[PDB]
Amino acid sequence: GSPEFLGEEDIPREPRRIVIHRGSTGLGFNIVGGEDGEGIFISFILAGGPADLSGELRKGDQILSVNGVDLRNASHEQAAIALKNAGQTVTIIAQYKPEEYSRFEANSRVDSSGRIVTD
């Protein structure tokens, strides 16, 4: 049978809830943004870290809130503090915003499925 590749399918752009149980370890991702009230975006997911293990976050996701704390207009340092101090159970509302994200990373653009491509 002819194979069905996930790479063709559009990445969902609606907000999602992600609950990460990480005890007293790092979440395992990097954030960019929070200067200009641009928003807080995931720039990197660590292999094997709690965010990776969730399978529900990706580079280009905007972090809308953590544990009900709205980060849409957060400053960078306060966003990091909110995340680091969120406790063992971390409830993130995230929304995939690859076009906005692509402005941060050099030579990056969005293809027809919404995937971020770096040349």
Binding site: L27, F29, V32, E35, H76, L83, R103
Partner: peptide, 7 residues
């Protein structure tokens, strides 16, 4: 834009 933090 420039800051990046691991969390």
């Amino acid at each position: 834009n420039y800051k990046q933090t691991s969390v």
